[PDB]
Amino acid sequence: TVVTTADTSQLYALAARHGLKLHGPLTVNELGLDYRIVIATVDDGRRWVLRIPRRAEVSAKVEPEARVLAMLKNRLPFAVPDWRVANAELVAYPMLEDSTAMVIQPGSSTPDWVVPQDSEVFAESFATALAALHAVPISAAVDAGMLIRTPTQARQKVADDVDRVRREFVVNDKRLHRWQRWLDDDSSWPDFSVVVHGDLYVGHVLIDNTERVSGMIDWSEARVDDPAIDMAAHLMVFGEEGLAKLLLTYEAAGGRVWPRLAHHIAERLAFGAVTYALFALDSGNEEYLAAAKAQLAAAE
């Protein structure tokens, strides 16, 4: 007998209650704070992703995300998870076998690999994919019950998050001033909102073996909001040169821009410290909290 991390009999029973018969190899990622993620082989010979909510508060988010993905499926020129099972105890979809655009071993803080800076096929196809996403009509998002933020509501959300961090943590004075100046800088903010992925970075983008964007995953944060939300992580990974290329092609592909978009994306990236701190706070995880407090107290 060999102790294994996965509980195959419990997983089998869970999947079977939702019409999936597990058979063959599986792998398990238990490091998620909200979900256990298992990639399992099913009697169709195919791999499926089992996205297992850990708690009632997580389970509550399944049905609204299911409506998002159902709406998006025909309206994007790339794949998204096909949640053929979606309920409080289990989400399951056939695995999208294409690689993520960043490969990282669970537990590790350093990726094995990220799609290269000089990959023109990746850069170009990410920009067009993003323009396509941001072209999904607002009416479709409303009809699907999505969270909608007008430009005023988008800016208010940022203000609320900044204020919550200020109430719970002690933040470097210059950091605070940066965020406030940004919130007060009318010219930075867009006068429209779009359907955004909300958690978009190389780890949630799938690519075919030519490095062309073929899919996106992990849509929990999707909503109608500030377009720049989906561009900040591109700046973080690919730098100002990568952002410059993105904006040129995004605009050429029909994406709507505004003159201070590049600036606004950089401010959104800085605002990532707020998002991280609130995640840490809401998680109750002391390691995340220690990192967050250190970041917030530090000079940029």
Ligand SMILES: CO[C@H]1C[C@H](O[C@H]2[C@H](C)[C@@H](O[C@@H]3O[C@H](C)C[C@H](N(C)C)[C@H]3O)[C@@H](C)C[C@]3(CO3)C(=O)[C@H](C)[C@@H](O)[C@@H](C)[C@@H](C)OC(=O)[C@@H]2C)O[C@@H](C)[C@@H]1O
């Ligand atoms: C938009 O700007 C981003 C910039 C940066 O975005 C992050 C990323 C994506 C964050 O994840 C996001 O963290 C938030 C809190 C929740 C979110 N979702 C689960 C909901 C999650 O995906 C990280 C904090 C994940 C984390 C903690 O495990 C790590 O420490 C790992 C090692 C992480 O550094 C890397 C693999 C590097 C190579 O990735 C990047 O820098 C991207 C660009 O960190 C953010 C918090 C900002 O929001």
Ligand SMILES: Nc1nc2c(ncn2[C@@H]2O[C@H](CO)[C@@H](O)[C@H]2O)c(=O)[nH]1
């Ligand atoms: N290639 C690929 N990875 C996935 C898929 N679903 C989940 N993952 C991985 O599991 C994590 C949790 O959803 C993601 O960040 C990916 O690393 C998928 O359909 N295809």
